[PDB]
Each structure stands twice: as structure tokens, then as C-alpha cells.
Amino acid sequence: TMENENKPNVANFEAAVAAKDYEKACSELLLILSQLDSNFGGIQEIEFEYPAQLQDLEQEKIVYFCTRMATAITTLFSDPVLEISDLGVQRFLVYQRWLALIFASSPFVNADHILQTYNREPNRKNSLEIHLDSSKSSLIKFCILYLPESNVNLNLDVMWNISPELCASLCFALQSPRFIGTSTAFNKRATILQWFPRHLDQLKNLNNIPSAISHDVYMHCSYDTSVNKHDVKRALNHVIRRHIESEYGWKDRDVAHIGYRNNKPVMVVLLEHFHSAHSIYRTHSTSMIAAREHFYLIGLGSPSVDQAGQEVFDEFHLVAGDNMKQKLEFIRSVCESNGAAIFYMPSIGMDMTTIFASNTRLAPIQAIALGHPATTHSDFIEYVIVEDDYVGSEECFSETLLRLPKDALPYVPSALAPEKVDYLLRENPEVVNIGIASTTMKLNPYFLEALKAIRDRAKVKVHFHFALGQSNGITHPYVERFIKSYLGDSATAHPHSPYHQYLRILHNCDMMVNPFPFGNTNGIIDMVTLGLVGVCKTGAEVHEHIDEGLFKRLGLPEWLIANTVDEYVERAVRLAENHQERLELRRYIIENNGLNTLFTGDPRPMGQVFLEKLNAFLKE
């Protein structure tokens, strides 16, 4: 070792590409990409210099960064001497989503101009089709630069045949970004969710696929529009179960008998993202407290869990292990020692160890809740806890729904809720401002097409204020470009802002519209807090149906709840066009508002319901 050998450094990267030092260049490149990954797109901790002009121009500074990286990547990867190891490809593919953002936020859009240099057949029918060498080396480099925004062509059947692990790897990469919003990207992803599950089902384990973004493929598929969008989870669990039998030498538990602590049977709860200021806690901690009426509750978590969340359990521990393997065995050793009755995950999806445990037998009764609102397709999870209010179709779940009363899951109020108001009931609106609360994953071509129509067919003039939670560093210019392509000057894409500045943007709006297919929950409480009103789309998945559940809970009128994209457009046109209706609707919410009713209820049911299942099982 020598000093400063690992600092992500844009200039060092550039120097190694120019020097033709191909192995230094790929490594300096990976320092920068892995840092982008740790920063979730931010460019902090990545040393680079910039023209004085860019001092207080963060966006521009970002696009500069991306364009320097793009041009260096270009001169490196266009060079036909460059070979990438078989280990190196796994590293590049695990971080593909950060190359996507580098090119996508630069003026280059994608990397097809490098892909085109890899083409060998000079006389072609299709100019977007890339006739490769027969080097595997050339196939690797093509896959690394096959970005979501690519216009070049892709045959998966051909690639699966040639190298299946490589093809799987690329599939994983394409599903991993947190922003899959433009049509080019969303269409790649869409076809992949139709094609790839029956193929991932073929794999023996996760040894040669980018496995560290496995949770990402797991979660991200929920944000697609197709009905079978979740199939990849099914295929994914099977590979995971295979993986854990062979590689981890897993033996499930014997769940014939159970044990007790202070005369109550045990519930072991595997946590993820459970801190008291976040929403899993705010939605579920209360039903978990109340379950302590009948169950001794052992929480297992990360050190991210503060005092308040640890206090929901009778006993709380860290999940131990260097490896996924030791983490599983620790989880096993707690269920084993206590003879757990119930194994429960109020959220599954956000963390990988949660998805590993759901491919595993650890108590007689295993259940998830909907912190992340999507069926697991796992044969080892018997039940889902859910508010009755919030389910559309039961067929959306391979698990059996355990439908609780609508006040069964009492929310905790965020401590950031303002204590005062200043309601803005604009009587003369030249312009009708419309707010969208959204993450970047919620953004799709269908949602944005819908807002275009609203803008186009509305006799009143509108402007859309997008308050994005997700738009950090290098993500943001691209999401900005995306939104501009549909709405140009009728939209403002505000970067990620803290709660207060965020309320301040909605507060200068007249109404809100809600994203689909994945709805909001927080956005709606925010909207009602500000005595604002709006339109949501309902549908069959729980995450499509929450908005309806919540409108009804908040006293909102049912015509605000659309069933089709067509209605949704039309209902927003109505509410933006009809000034007086809008206003009265606002005053009705300001005056009669069910917000009160969210923060209370009888949280006992979840515990009751589980006890009933356990006692039933105990008769065997």
C-alpha cells in the first residue's frame, strides 16, 4: 500500500485514461462509481475542480461533473484494446445505474455512441443493431454500456443462449436504478419484467449475478404498470432458497413445538428501516406495542433503530454476522432458543436480509406487513397484515391477507408537523398551481402523459410544482429533462428539500394530483394538513388502493377518486377548471378533517388475530 490510493478523484481517472494505463483507469473509475453509490447520487467525497463560474451553480456543476466523466468514459471504452476481467464486469454491472446517470444527465443522453464503435458489419439494414466481434470481451463491454436510455437494439433470447449469467447480470442492472421514468427506460424495464422471470428461475444460485442490488430488483418491479409485474419476485425467491441451501448449508427449523417468555408465546420481528422518525414505525409500531398483550416481542434490528423503536419490543437485539450466512443463523438462533411462535416482518424488501429470511422456515406462523406494499410470492410466508380499507383485489397476493379493521393500525404523528397554519385560498388565480409529492420511483411515462393531457385539455392555465424526495446530485438533471419533455414551462422540478421548504412548495398550490400506479400516503396527510385537495387513481394492488382508502378516511368526496387514467385526467381538469367548487371543497377540508381519526383507533387486533391463528395451530 501507498498514500491516497483509494480517493475517488476525477482528475486521476482522466490522467489514467490519457496515459493509456487501462487497469489504472478502470480502478479509478470504480472508486468514483462506488462513491456515487454510497452517496446515492451525490458527488460529495469525489474530488474535482471546476471553472470559477460554476461556484454557486450546483445543477450546472453536477452536469459539468457528468460531462467530464462521460467524455473520459468515452475515450476509455471506445478503445478496442481495453479488456475487462471477469470479476471487473461484475463490479461494472453492479454499478451500471451510476453510469446511466452519468450519461443521462450529460448532454449525451446515453452511450450508444460508444456502442456504435463496437460494430463490425459495415453494411446493415438496421443502424441501431450492433454486430459484435465474437470476443466475449466485446460482449462484456457492450453490456456494461447497454444503459436504460439506450436506443440500440437488444435481443434477450440471443444473449441468454450465448451467456445466461451475463444476460441476468444486465437484467439486474436495468432494474436497479431508482429512476425508471422515461419511456425508453420504462419500456426496457417493462419487457424485462415479462421476459426475465422464467429465465432467472433457471439459475442455481446468486454467485455470478450482481447480487448486491437484489433488493433493488425485488422492490423496483412494483412501480411498473403490468398486472403480473411481481413475477420476478417468485423467480427470485427460488434462486435465493437454492442459494441458501447449497452455499449456506441451511437447515430450516422444526416448528412443531413452541416456547414461552413470561407465560406468553413469542413473536420474533425482523426489522428494516425502523427508526422512530420514519414511516414504518409511524404506521406499525402501535399495533406492535398492542400485540404485547398476548405475545412476548423480541425485536431484531440494525443500529439504525433509535430508543423509541427499540422500546416497542420487550427485548431488542442487533442482527449479528459478517456474512448473510451468520445473520440468518443469528436470526435462527433466536427463534430456536425461544421456540418462536410467530415470525413477523412489518416491512420486507428494503434490506436484503429480510428477503433472505422470507425464504426460510423459522416459526409455525410467518407473516409480513406492507411497509413495502407488495406480495412476496414466497411459499414460506403464510399471511399479510393489512388494513381492510386498503385492499383492492385479493389475487394480488400469493400470501393470505389478514384484513384488519380500518382503525386497527393507528399512526404516530410526525414531530415535524407544523402547529400553526396560514391557509392560502387564492380567489383570483390567473394560474392554477398544482403540486405533486413524489419519489423518483413513482415517476413513469403513464403518469406524466396524464399530466400532459391535464395541461392540454384544461381551459384554465396551470403550472405543476413537483416536490421530489429522490432528486439528489446526478439524478436530478435527468429527472428534470424527463419532466421538461412533457410539460416544458408548465412545470418546476424542485430538488430534494427538507420538510419545511417542502411544505412551503405545496402551500403555494391550489390543488394536488397524486402519482400512479404507486400511490402516496404521506403526501395525502400533507395535502390535508395544508387544507388542500386533489385527485388520486385507484386500482387493484394495495399500493394503488391506499389513496382511495385514505381519501375516504379523510372525508374526501368519491369523485376525486378516479378508476381509469381517462377519468383521472378529467377529474383534475374539473377541479382545476371549477374555481368555486375547488374552493368550497378546500373550505370543507379545512373545517371537517379526519386527520384526527388516523392517529387513533384500537391497535389490539393484530395481536388478537395472530393469537387466534396460533391457538388454531396448537390443536395439531
Coordinates of C-alpha atoms in Angstrom, one line a residue, residues 165-453:
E165 CA -25.2 -15.1 -16.3
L166 CA -24.1 -12.1 -18.3
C167 CA -27.7 -11.6 -19.6
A168 CA -29.0 -12.0 -16.0
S169 CA -26.5 -9.5 -14.8
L170 CA -27.6 -6.9 -17.3
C171 CA -31.3 -7.6 -16.5
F172 CA -30.4 -7.0 -12.8
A173 CA -28.6 -3.8 -13.7
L174 CA -31.6 -2.5 -15.8
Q175 CA -33.9 -3.0 -12.9
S176 CA -31.7 -1.4 -10.3
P177 CA -31.9 2.4 -10.9
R178 CA -34.1 4.4 -8.6
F179 CA -35.4 6.4 -11.6
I180 CA -37.1 4.4 -14.3
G181 CA -39.2 7.1 -15.7
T182 CA -38.6 8.0 -19.3
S183 CA -40.3 5.8 -21.9
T184 CA -37.0 4.5 -23.3
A185 CA -36.1 3.3 -19.8
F186 CA -39.5 2.2 -18.6
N187 CA -40.1 0.2 -21.8
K188 CA -36.8 -1.7 -21.3
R189 CA -37.8 -2.5 -17.7
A190 CA -41.3 -3.4 -18.7
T191 CA -40.3 -6.0 -21.3
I192 CA -37.8 -7.3 -18.8
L193 CA -40.4 -7.9 -16.2
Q194 CA -42.3 -10.0 -18.8
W195 CA -39.3 -11.9 -20.1
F196 CA -36.8 -12.3 -17.3
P197 CA -38.7 -14.1 -14.6
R198 CA -38.9 -17.5 -16.4
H199 CA -35.1 -17.2 -17.0
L200 CA -34.0 -16.1 -13.6
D201 CA -35.8 -19.2 -12.5
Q202 CA -33.2 -21.3 -14.2
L203 CA -30.2 -20.2 -12.1
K204 CA -28.6 -22.4 -9.4
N205 CA -27.6 -19.5 -7.0
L206 CA -26.6 -15.8 -7.0
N207 CA -22.8 -16.4 -7.4
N208 CA -22.5 -14.8 -10.9
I209 CA -25.1 -12.1 -10.9
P210 CA -24.9 -8.7 -9.3
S211 CA -26.4 -9.9 -6.1
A212 CA -25.9 -6.7 -4.0
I213 CA -28.7 -4.9 -5.9
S214 CA -31.0 -7.9 -5.4
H215 CA -33.3 -6.0 -3.1
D216 CA -33.5 -3.4 -5.8
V217 CA -34.8 -5.8 -8.4
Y218 CA -37.2 -7.1 -5.7
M219 CA -38.6 -3.6 -4.9
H220 CA -38.4 -1.8 -8.1
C221 CA -40.8 -4.1 -10.0
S222 CA -43.7 -2.7 -8.0
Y223 CA -43.5 0.5 -9.9
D224 CA -44.4 -1.0 -13.2
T225 CA -47.9 -1.0 -14.7
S226 CA -48.5 -4.6 -15.8
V227 CA -50.6 -7.0 -13.7
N228 CA -48.0 -9.7 -13.4
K229 CA -45.2 -7.2 -12.6
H230 CA -44.3 -9.1 -9.4
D231 CA -43.4 -12.4 -11.1
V232 CA -39.7 -11.6 -10.9
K233 CA -40.0 -11.9 -7.1
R234 CA -41.3 -15.5 -7.4
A235 CA -38.3 -16.4 -9.6
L236 CA -36.0 -14.5 -7.3
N237 CA -37.1 -16.3 -4.1
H238 CA -36.4 -19.8 -5.7
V239 CA -32.8 -18.7 -6.6
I240 CA -32.4 -17.4 -3.2
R241 CA -33.7 -20.6 -1.5
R242 CA -31.4 -22.6 -3.8
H243 CA -28.5 -20.2 -2.8
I244 CA -29.0 -20.6 0.8
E245 CA -29.3 -24.4 0.9
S246 CA -26.2 -25.1 -1.2
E247 CA -23.9 -22.2 -0.2
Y248 CA -25.1 -21.7 3.4
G249 CA -25.9 -25.4 4.2
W250 CA -29.3 -24.2 5.6
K251 CA -31.5 -26.5 7.8
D252 CA -34.9 -25.0 8.5
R253 CA -36.4 -25.0 12.0
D254 CA -38.6 -27.6 13.5
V255 CA -41.8 -25.7 14.1
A256 CA -43.9 -28.5 15.6
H257 CA -43.3 -27.1 19.2
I258 CA -43.2 -23.6 20.6
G259 CA -41.8 -21.9 23.8
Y260 CA -42.9 -19.0 26.1
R261 CA -41.4 -16.0 27.9
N262 CA -43.3 -14.6 31.0
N263 CA -46.2 -17.1 30.1
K264 CA -46.7 -15.7 26.6
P265 CA -45.8 -17.3 23.3
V266 CA -43.0 -15.4 21.4
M267 CA -43.2 -13.1 18.3
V268 CA -39.8 -12.5 16.7
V269 CA -39.9 -9.4 14.4
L270 CA -37.2 -8.8 11.8
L271 CA -36.9 -5.1 11.2
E272 CA -35.7 -2.9 8.5
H273 CA -35.6 0.9 8.2
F274 CA -37.4 1.1 11.6
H275 CA -36.4 4.4 13.1
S276 CA -39.0 6.4 15.0
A277 CA -38.9 9.4 12.5
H278 CA -39.5 7.1 9.6
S279 CA -42.8 5.7 8.3
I280 CA -42.6 2.0 9.2
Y281 CA -42.5 3.0 12.8
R282 CA -45.2 5.6 12.2
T283 CA -47.5 3.1 10.6
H284 CA -46.9 0.0 12.6
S285 CA -45.2 0.5 15.9
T286 CA -48.5 0.9 17.6
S287 CA -50.0 -2.4 16.5
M288 CA -46.8 -3.9 17.6
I289 CA -46.9 -2.4 21.1
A290 CA -50.5 -3.6 21.4
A291 CA -49.6 -7.2 20.5
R292 CA -47.6 -7.3 23.7
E293 CA -51.0 -8.1 25.3
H294 CA -50.7 -11.6 24.2
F295 CA -47.1 -12.1 22.9
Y296 CA -43.6 -11.6 24.2
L297 CA -42.0 -9.5 21.5
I298 CA -38.3 -9.8 20.5
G299 CA -37.2 -7.1 18.1
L300 CA -34.1 -7.8 15.8
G301 CA -32.6 -4.9 14.0
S302 CA -29.8 -2.7 12.8
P303 CA -28.3 0.0 14.9
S304 CA -30.4 2.5 12.8
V305 CA -33.2 1.8 15.3
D306 CA -33.4 4.5 17.9
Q307 CA -34.6 4.3 21.5
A308 CA -38.2 4.8 20.6
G309 CA -38.4 1.9 18.1
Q310 CA -36.4 -0.5 20.4
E311 CA -38.9 0.3 23.1
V312 CA -41.7 -1.1 21.1
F313 CA -40.4 -4.6 21.8
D314 CA -39.9 -6.4 25.1
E315 CA -36.3 -7.3 24.1
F316 CA -34.2 -6.0 21.3
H317 CA -31.0 -7.2 19.7
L318 CA -28.7 -6.4 16.8
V319 CA -28.7 -8.8 13.9
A320 CA -25.1 -10.3 14.1
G321 CA -22.9 -11.9 11.4
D322 CA -20.2 -10.7 9.0
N323 CA -22.0 -12.7 6.2
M324 CA -25.6 -13.0 5.1
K325 CA -25.0 -16.6 6.4
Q326 CA -24.3 -15.6 10.0
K327 CA -27.1 -13.0 10.0
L328 CA -29.5 -15.9 9.1
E329 CA -28.1 -18.2 11.7
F330 CA -28.4 -15.5 14.3
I331 CA -32.0 -15.0 13.4
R332 CA -32.3 -18.8 13.5
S333 CA -30.6 -19.0 17.0
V334 CA -33.2 -16.6 18.4
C335 CA -36.2 -18.3 17.1
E336 CA -34.6 -21.7 18.1
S337 CA -33.8 -20.7 21.6
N338 CA -37.1 -19.1 22.3
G339 CA -39.1 -21.6 20.2
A340 CA -40.7 -18.6 18.4
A341 CA -44.5 -18.9 17.6
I342 CA -44.7 -16.0 15.2
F343 CA -42.2 -14.6 12.7
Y344 CA -43.1 -11.2 11.5
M345 CA -41.7 -8.6 9.2
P346 CA -43.6 -5.3 9.2
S347 CA -41.7 -4.4 6.1
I348 CA -39.9 -6.6 3.5
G349 CA -37.9 -5.5 0.5
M350 CA -35.9 -2.6 1.8
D351 CA -33.0 -4.7 3.0
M352 CA -31.7 -8.0 1.7
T353 CA -31.6 -9.9 4.8
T354 CA -35.3 -9.5 5.1
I355 CA -35.8 -11.2 1.7
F356 CA -33.4 -13.9 2.7
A357 CA -35.4 -14.7 5.9
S358 CA -38.6 -14.9 4.0
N359 CA -37.2 -17.9 2.1
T360 CA -36.8 -19.8 5.3
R361 CA -38.8 -21.6 7.9
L362 CA -38.3 -20.2 11.5
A363 CA -41.7 -20.2 13.2
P364 CA -45.0 -22.0 12.6
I365 CA -46.6 -18.8 11.5
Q366 CA -44.8 -16.3 9.3
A367 CA -46.2 -13.0 8.2
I368 CA -45.3 -9.8 6.7
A369 CA -46.9 -6.4 6.7
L370 CA -46.9 -3.8 3.9
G371 CA -44.1 -1.3 4.9
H372 CA -43.2 -2.0 1.3
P373 CA -46.6 -2.7 -0.2
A374 CA -46.1 -5.8 -2.4
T375 CA -46.8 -9.5 -2.1
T376 CA -43.6 -11.6 -1.5
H377 CA -44.5 -14.5 -3.8
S378 CA -42.8 -16.6 -1.1
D379 CA -44.2 -20.1 -0.2
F380 CA -42.8 -19.7 3.3
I381 CA -44.9 -16.6 4.2
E382 CA -48.4 -17.6 5.3
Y383 CA -50.0 -14.1 5.9
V384 CA -50.0 -10.4 5.2
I385 CA -51.3 -8.0 7.7
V386 CA -53.2 -5.1 6.1
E387 CA -55.9 -2.6 6.8
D388 CA -59.2 -3.7 5.2
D389 CA -59.7 -0.1 4.0
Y390 CA -56.6 -0.5 1.7
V391 CA -57.0 -3.7 -0.2
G392 CA -58.5 -3.7 -3.8
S393 CA -58.0 -7.3 -5.1
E394 CA -57.1 -10.4 -3.0
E395 CA -55.5 -12.0 -6.2
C396 CA -52.6 -9.5 -5.9
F397 CA -51.2 -11.6 -3.1
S398 CA -49.9 -15.2 -3.1
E399 CA -50.0 -14.9 0.8
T400 CA -53.3 -15.0 2.6
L401 CA -54.5 -11.4 3.6
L402 CA -55.2 -10.9 7.2
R403 CA -57.5 -7.9 6.8
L404 CA -57.7 -5.7 9.9
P405 CA -60.3 -3.1 10.8
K406 CA -59.6 0.4 9.5
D407 CA -58.6 1.9 12.8
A408 CA -56.5 -1.2 13.7
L409 CA -53.2 0.4 12.7
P410 CA -53.1 3.8 14.4
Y411 CA -50.4 6.2 13.1
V412 CA -47.8 8.1 15.1
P413 CA -47.8 11.8 14.2
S414 CA -44.5 13.0 12.7
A415 CA -42.8 15.5 15.2
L416 CA -42.3 17.8 12.2
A417 CA -46.0 18.6 11.8
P418 CA -46.5 22.3 12.0
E419 CA -48.6 23.6 14.9
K420 CA -50.0 26.6 13.0
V421 CA -51.5 27.2 9.6
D422 CA -51.8 30.0 7.1
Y423 CA -54.3 28.7 4.6
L424 CA -54.0 30.2 1.1
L425 CA -57.3 30.3 -0.6
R426 CA -56.5 32.2 -3.8
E427 CA -59.6 33.9 -5.1
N428 CA -58.1 35.3 -8.3
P429 CA -55.8 32.7 -9.7
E430 CA -54.6 33.7 -13.1
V431 CA -52.6 30.4 -12.9
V432 CA -53.8 27.3 -11.2
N433 CA -50.8 25.8 -9.4
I434 CA -50.9 22.0 -8.9
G435 CA -48.5 20.2 -6.6
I436 CA -47.1 16.7 -6.9
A437 CA -45.5 15.0 -3.9
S438 CA -43.4 12.2 -5.3
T439 CA -40.3 10.0 -5.2
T440 CA -38.4 9.4 -8.4
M441 CA -39.5 5.7 -8.5
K442 CA -43.2 6.8 -8.7
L443 CA -42.5 8.7 -11.9
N444 CA -43.5 6.9 -15.1
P445 CA -44.5 7.6 -18.7
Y446 CA -48.1 6.9 -17.9
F447 CA -48.2 9.3 -15.1
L448 CA -46.6 12.1 -17.0
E449 CA -48.7 11.5 -20.1
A450 CA -51.7 12.0 -17.9
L451 CA -50.4 15.4 -16.6
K452 CA -49.7 16.5 -20.2
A453 CA -53.3 15.8 -21.1

